[PDB]
Design an enzyme around this catalytic site. Structure first.
Site, mmCIF file in Angstrom:
data_model
loop_
_atom_site.group_PDB
_atom_site.id
_atom_site.type_symbol
_atom_site.label_atom_id
_atom_site.label_comp_id
_atom_site.label_asym_id
_atom_site.label_seq_id
_atom_site.Cartn_x
_atom_site.Cartn_y
_atom_site.Cartn_z
ATOM 1 N N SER A 1 0.852 -1.180 0.000
ATOM 2 C CA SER A 1 0.000 0.000 0.000
ATOM 3 C C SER A 1 0.889 1.231 0.000
ATOM 4 O O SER A 1 1.478 1.575 1.028
ATOM 5 C CB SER A 1 -0.935 0.000 1.205
ATOM 6 O OG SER A 1 -1.757 1.146 1.186
ATOM 7 N N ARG A 2 0.966 1.906 -1.142
ATOM 8 C CA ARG A 2 1.927 2.982 -1.321
ATOM 9 C C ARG A 2 1.665 4.173 -0.425
ATOM 10 O O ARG A 2 2.559 5.009 -0.273
ATOM 11 C CB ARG A 2 1.918 3.445 -2.770
ATOM 12 C CG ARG A 2 2.552 2.494 -3.745
ATOM 13 C CD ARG A 2 2.349 3.010 -5.139
ATOM 14 N NE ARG A 2 3.403 2.601 -6.055
ATOM 15 C CZ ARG A 2 3.223 1.860 -7.139
ATOM 16 N NH1 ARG A 2 2.029 1.411 -7.472
ATOM 17 N NH2 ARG A 2 4.254 1.558 -7.903
ATOM 18 N N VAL A 3 0.475 4.289 0.155
ATOM 19 C CA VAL A 3 0.247 5.295 1.182
ATOM 20 C C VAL A 3 0.585 4.761 2.563
ATOM 21 O O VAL A 3 0.699 5.549 3.509
ATOM 22 C CB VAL A 3 -1.199 5.804 1.173
ATOM 23 C CG1 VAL A 3 -1.524 6.392 -0.166
ATOM 24 C CG2 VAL A 3 -2.147 4.700 1.521
#
Ligand code: ATP
Ligand code: MG
Lengths: 284, 342, 117, 52, 52, 86, 86, 117
Positions: free
Chosen positions: F33-35
Site C-alpha cells: 500500500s503505497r500510502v
C-alpha cells in the site's frame, strides 16, 4: 529466449528427470541388497561376543590391555565415508559431528589420529588438515573384510603400543529407510555390555593351548568384525540417502518444467502476434 | 555494455606507431561520449593519427545514415594511394535504424521487424569497400606516381544484439557479409574475463594467414587447450569426482583462460604476447597458482624488458621463429622462474 | 565512472570482486535448484554463503521509507561501505548469520544486530 | 647439519625475495610521486601560458 | 660419507648466500631504473602538454 | 503492469494459497500500500507494525525450512508464530 | 496439428529408430488407429492384441536399462522379449 | 546412396563399422572422464584405441590447404580408403601409435610415418 530456445531447455530438463528417476530405482534396489548383506553379519559378531563374555569378564578375570580403562593422552578415530557423491548431506553431517567432538577432545590437550575408509573423507580431511595415518579406498559397493585389515591393523598396533589410549568408530546408523543417524561409538577399550556368564558357571572350556593366547586373537578379530559391520551399515545408509535425494531432485525437475512451459507458451504467443502484425500492417 | 567500443578503440590506439591511419566514425552516439573517447585518444598519442566522423543522436536521419559512406570515402583516399587505413563503424545497428526511419517516412513497403527490403544491400556495398588492392591498381590509379605498394582499408563494424539474440534481421545480415566475428559475452564480462571474447564461437576466415609466424606457431596450441577445456567444462561442477588424467586438462584450461585477461588501454607488442603464450604453451605455468597468474605475467614482462631487450627488439621487428629463438625463450623462462619472484 | 583512474584502485577492485561473486552465484542456481545445496563442492558452499550475505548488505533503509517500515533511515559514506564489502568478501565477517546484514547501515550495525539475533 | 644448511638457505633466499618485493613498492610509489608532480607542473603551466 | 656430506654443508651457505645477494642486486637496479624512467616520463609528459 | 503503474498499491491474491484453504489468499511480499500506515487508525497501526514483512519472511523461510532446517529453535519459534498467524 | 485433428489416427515415423536401423521406424505409443480392431482381420486381432502396449513399455524399460546393470531377471525376461519382437 | 545394393557390401559394412566404433567411443569418453582409463575391459581399451585411430585417419591434407599448412596434398582412391579403414578395424595396424595416422593421406603412408615418430 524465443520458443526454440525454451523448448530445447524443456527437453533437456525432461531428460534430466529421466536420469534421476533411473538413479532412484537403482539405489532403491541396492539398498535392499546391501541390507541383506547387513543382516548376514550379525551371527559372527554376536557369537564371538558371547565367547568373550565367558573368557574375559567371566567369574575368572584376565589381564588384557584392551579391557582396562587406562588414561587418555590421545585418541583414534576410524572414519567411514562414501566413495560416491549425490548422497545428500550424509558425509558432511558426519564430519561435522566428528569435528565437534574432536575439538572437544583437543580442548583437553589430547591429540587425535584418523584412519579413513572411503575416499570422500580422505579428500575432506586432507583439506581440513586432519591427521590421516592410513586409508583404504575404492571398496565401492563391495566392502570386504580383507581390505579393512590394513587400517584396523595400524590402529590396533598403535593402541597396544601405548600410542593410543582410546579408539572410536564414527559412522552412520541405518535405522529406517527414511532415517539414518550419524554416530560416534567406542570399541577400545572394550565396552562393558551385559552378556553375563553367571548362568554359564555350569561349564568351562578346554583351552588349547591356553586362554590368553586365544583371548588376544578373539578381541582382535572382534574389533575387525565391528569395523566391518559399520562399513556395511554405512553402505546401506548411503544407498537410502541417495534414493531419497534423487526422489527430491526428480520432483524439483518436475516443477521446473511447469515454470518453463509457462514461459514457453508466453513466447509462442508473442511470436505469433508479432509476426502477424508485421504482415497485416505491411499491406497498404 | 560489454566492451565493444573499448576493443575497437584499443585497436585504434595500438596503431599510434604502425603506419596505419585510423578512422573512427560514430553513428547516433551522444556527443558527450564522442568528446570523451576523443579526450582518451588525446591522452595516449593516437589522436594525431586518426580522423573522427560524428553524427550525434540529435542529427537528422539522413546524416546518421550517410556517415559511414563519408568515412569509407576518407579511408579510400589512403587505400587508393598505396597506404594502409583502418575504419571503425560504431553501431551499424544505428545506421540501420536511421535508414528504417527514412524508409518508413517515404512509405516504402516494410519487411521484417519493419526494416526495409534493401537493408542488406545497404551494408553490403558499404563493407565491400574494405579491400586490399594490388600494386597494379595503385599504379593505374595514381597514374604512375606510386609503384610496388598495395593499399588496404580494414573495417571493424560494430553491432549490438538484444539479449544475446543473433537471429534478428541486422545481426543476421552483417554476420553474413563480414569475414569473421568477435563475440563478446556479458556473462564472461561479469565473471571477470575481460575482454570478454568468446573463443568458441568467434571465427576469422582469414585465420593464420594473417599472423606473424611466431604467433601462428604458438597459438595453435592455445586453440586446442581451450577446445579441450570447453569440452570438459561440464564436469567442473562435479570436479572433485574426476580423474587426474583429465584434471590436468581441466586445470590447464582455467590457467590459460586466466592468462587471456587483460587491462584496458594497455596494449602489448607482439614480442610480449608471444613470450607470454610460449610461457603457458610449454607448461611453465603448470605449477603457478591460478590467483597469481597475472602477477606472474607482469613480473615476466618487466624482467624481460630490461634484462633481455635485444631479443624483444628482434621479435617485434621481424616476428620470425627458429629453434634458436625457441632456445632463447626457454632460457629466459628458466632464468625467470628461479632467479626472481612474483 | 567506474574506472581505476577515477575511483582509485581499492574501490574499483572491491566493486569487481562483488560482481564476480554474485555472477558465480548465478551460475550455481540451476544446480542448486535441481540437486539441492548439498551437492556443491565445499568451496562453492562458501561462495554461496558469502553471496547471500553480500545481497543483504546491499540493502539499506531509507529516510523516505519510514512510512512503509518504521525503521529509521541511514546514510552510509563511501569510505565506510567499501570497507564493509571488502570485509565480507575477505571472509572476516564469515561467522555471522545472513539476517544480521539485512537492512542495516555500516558493517558495525550488522555486527551489533547479530548479538540480538 | 645438512638440513641446517638446507633450511637456512631456503629462508635466506625468501628474505632476499621479500627485500626485493619491498624494494619494488618504494619504486612504484616514487614513480607516482614524481609523475603527479609532472602532471601538476604541466597543468599549472598550460593554464597560464594559454591565459597569457 | 662425512666428507661427502659436509662438503655440501660447507658449500651451500656460500652458494645460496650469493644467490640471495644476486636477487637483491637485481631489485636494486630495478629501483634505480624506475627512478630514471620516471624522470624520462616527467620530461616527456610536460613537453607533450606544452606542445599541446 | 500498466495498471500496477497507475494505482497506489495492489492486493495480489495468489491461487496456490487459495487452493490451500488460505482465504483470502493475500500474498504478502508482492502486495503493498503505497500510502502505507498513514491511512490506518492509530490502534491498528500500533498493533500491526511491520507484520507483513514478518509474514513475507516466514513464507520465504518455509522455502528452505521444509526438507531441512538450521538454527532450529529460533527459526522454530519464528515458524510457529508465522503459522498460527496465517 | 490441423491435420492430426482431421484424420482417424496417425502412423508416427520416428527418426531415431530409422537411423538406428529399425525400418520401418514405426513408433508405438504415440501412433494410434482410432477405428481400432474393427478394421483388423480376426486372426490378427487375436495375435496382435498385446504387442502394442507391451512394446510401448519395453521401450521405456530399455531406457531405464542403461543406467542399471544387475537387472532383476523378472525384468530381464521382458527386456529380452521386447528386443526379440523389435 | 549408402545402402548395400549400390555401394557393395564391402563398402557398406566398412562404413557401418566405422559408425559403430565411433558411436561406442562416445559412450566411453564419459566413463574415462570419471573413472580414468584403467577400469575399462581389454576390448574396451582396444575399442578406444581403434576409435581414436579411425578418428585420426579421417583427416587428410589438401592440395588447396597446402597454402595454410605447407604440407603437400594427397589424393586417396576409394579402394584404398576402404582397405585402410577395414585394416584398422580388424586390428592389423594396432601396433602403430595414433599420431602415425594424423593427416597421413593413404594407409601405406601411416605404416611409413610410424617409423620416423
Ligand atoms: N579490458 C577491460 N578491462 C576492464 N574493463 C573494461 C575492459 N574493457 C572495457 N571495460 C569497461 O567496460 C565498460 C563498458 O565499456 P564500453 O563502453 O567500451 O562497452 P560498449 O559495448 O561500448 O558499451 P556501449 O555499447 O554502451 O557503448 C567501460 O566502462 C570499460 O571501463
Ligand atoms: Mg560505444
Amino acid at each position: 529466449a524465443g520458443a526454440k530456445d525454451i523448448r530445447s531447455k524443456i527437453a533437456s530438463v525432461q531428460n534430466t528427470q529421466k536420469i534421476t528417476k533411473a538413479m532412484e530405482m537403482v539405489a532403491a534396489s541396492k539398498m535392499r541388497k546391501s541390507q541383506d548383506r547387513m543382516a548376514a553379519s550379525r551371527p559372527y559378531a554376536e557369537t564371538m561376543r558371547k565367547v568373550i563374555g565367558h573368557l574375559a569378564h567371566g567369574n575368572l578375570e584376565y589381564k588384557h590391555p584392551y579391557l582396562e580403562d587406562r588414561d587418555v593422552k590421545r585418541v583414534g578415530y576410524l572414519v567411514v565415508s562414501t566413495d560416491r557423491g549425490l548422497a545428500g548431506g550424509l558425509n558432511i553431517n558426519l564430519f561435522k559431528k566428528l569435528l565437534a567432538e574432536m575439538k572437544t577432545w583437543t580442548d583437553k590437550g589430547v591429540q587425535a589420529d584418523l584412519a579413513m575408509i572411503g575416499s570422500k573423507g580422505v579428500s575432506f580431511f586432507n583439506s581440513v588438515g586432519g591427521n590421516v595415518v592410513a586409508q583404504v579406498t575404492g571398496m565401492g559397493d563391495n566392502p570386504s573384510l580383507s581390505e579393512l585389515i590394513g587400517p584396523v591393523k595400524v590402529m590396533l598396533q598403535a593402541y597396544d603400543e601405548g600410542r593410543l589410549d582410546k579408539l572410536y568408530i564414527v559412522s552412520n546408523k541405518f535405522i529406517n529407510t527414511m532415517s539414518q543417524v550419524p554416530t560416534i561409538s567406542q570399541l577400545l577399550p572394550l565396552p562393558a555390555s551385559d552378556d553375563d556368564d553367571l548362568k554359564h558357571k555350569s561349564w568351562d572350556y578346554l583351552y588349547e593351548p591356553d586362554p590368553k593366547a586365544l583371548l588376544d586373537t578373539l578381541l582382535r578379530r572382534y574389533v575387525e568384525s565391528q569395523v566391518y559391520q559399520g562399513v556395511v551399515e554405512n553402505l546401506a545408509s548411503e544407498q537410502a540417502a541417495r534414493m531419497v535425494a534423487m526422489k527430491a531432485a526428480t520432483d524439483n525437475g518436475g516443477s521446473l518444467i511447469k515454470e518453463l512451459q509457462l514461459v514457453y507458451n508466453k513466447a509462442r504467443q508473442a511470436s505469433i502476434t508479432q509476426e502477424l502484425t508485421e504482415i497485416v500492417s505491411g499491406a497498404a | 555494455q560489454t566492451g565493444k567500443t573499448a576493443l575497437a578503440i584499443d585497436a585504434i590506439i595500438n596503431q599510434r606507431d604502425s603506419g596505419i591511419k585510423c578512422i573512427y566514425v560514430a553513428i547516433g552516439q551522444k556527443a558527450s561520449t564522442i568528446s570523451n573517447v576523443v579526450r582518451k585518444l588525446e591522452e595516449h598519442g593516437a589522436l594525431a593519427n586518426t580522423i573522427v566522423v560524428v553524427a550525434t543522436a540529435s542529427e537528422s536521419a539522413a546524416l546518421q545514415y550517410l556517415a559511414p559512406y563519408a568515412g569509407c570515402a576518407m579511408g579510400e583516399y589512403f587505400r587508393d594511394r598505396g597506404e594502409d587505413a583502418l575504419i571503425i563503424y560504431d553501431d551499424l545497428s544505428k545506421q540501420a535504424v536511421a535508414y528504417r526511419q527514412i524508409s518508413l517516412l517515404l512509405r516504402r513497403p516494410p519487411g521484417r521487424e519493419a526494416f526495409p527490403g534493401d537493408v542488406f544491400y545497404l551494408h553490403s556495398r558499404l563493407l565491400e569497400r574494405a579491400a586490399r588492392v594490388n600494386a597494379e591498381y595503385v599504379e593505374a590509379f595514381t597514374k604512375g606516381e606510386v609503384k610496388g605498394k598495395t593499399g588496404s582499408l580494414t573495417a571493424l563494424p560494430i553491432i549490438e544484439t538484444q539479449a544475446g539474440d543473433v537471429s534478428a534481421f541486422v545481426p543476421t545480415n552483417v554476420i553474413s557479409i563480414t569475414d569473421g566475428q568477435i563475440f563478446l559475452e556479458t556473462n564472461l564480462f561479469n565473471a571477470g574475463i575481460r575482454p570478454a571474447v568468446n573463443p568458441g564461437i568467434s571465427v576469422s576466415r582469414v585465420g593464420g594467414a594473417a599472423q606473424t609466424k611466431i604467433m601462428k606457431k604458438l597459438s595453435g596450441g592455445i586453440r586446442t587447450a581451450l577446445a579441450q577445456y570447453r569440452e570438459l567444462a561440464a564436469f567442473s561442477q562435479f570436479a572433485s569426482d574426476l580423474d587426474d588424467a583429465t584434471r590436468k586438462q581441466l586445470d590447464h584450461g582455467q590457467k590459460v583462460t586466466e592468462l587471456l585477461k587483460q587491462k584496458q588501454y594497455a596494449p602489448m607488442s607482439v614480442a610480449q604476447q608471444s613470450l607470454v603464450l610460449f610461457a603457458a604453451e610449454r607448461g611453465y605455468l603448470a605449477d603457478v597458482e591460478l590467483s597469481k597468474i597475472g602477477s606472474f605475467e607482469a613480473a615476466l614482462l618487466a624482467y624481460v624488458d630490461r634484462d633481455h631487450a635485444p631479443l624483444m627488439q628482434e621479435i617485434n621487428q621481424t616476428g620470425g621463429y627458429n629453434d634458436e629463438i625457441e632456445g632463447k625463450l626457454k632460457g629466459i623462462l628458466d632464468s625467470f622462474k628461479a632467479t626472481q619472484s612474483w | 565512472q567506474l574506472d581505476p583512474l577515477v575511483v582509485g584502485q581499492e574501490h574499483y577492485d572491491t566493486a569487481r570482486g562483488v560482481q564476480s561473486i554474485l555472477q558465480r552465484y548465478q551460475e550455481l542456481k540451476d544446480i542448486i535448484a535441481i540437486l539441492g545445496m548439498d551437492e556443491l563442492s565445499e568451496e562453492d558452499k562458501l561462495v554461496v554463503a558469502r553471496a547471500r550475505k553480500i545481497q543483504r548488505f546491499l540493502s539499506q533503509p531509507f529516510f523516505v521509507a519510514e512510512v512503509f517500515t518504521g525503521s529509521p533511515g541511514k546514510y552510509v559514506s563511501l569510505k565506510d561501505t567499501i570497507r564493509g564489502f571488502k570485509g565480507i568478501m575477505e571472509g572476516e565477517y564469515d561467522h555471522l548469520p545472513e539476517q544480521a546484514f539485512y537492512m542495516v547501515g555500516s558493517i558495525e550495525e550488522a555486527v551489533e544486530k547479530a548479538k540480538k539475533l | 647439519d645438512l638440513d641446517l644448511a638446507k633450511a637456512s638457505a631456503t629462508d635466506q633466499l625468501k628474505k632476499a625475495k621479500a627485500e626485493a618485493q619491498v624494494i619494488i613498492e618504494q619504486a612504484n610509489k616514487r614513480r607516482s610521486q614524481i609523475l603527479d608532480e609532472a602532471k601538476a607542473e604541466a597543468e599549472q603551466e598550460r593554464t597560464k601560458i594559454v591565459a597569457q
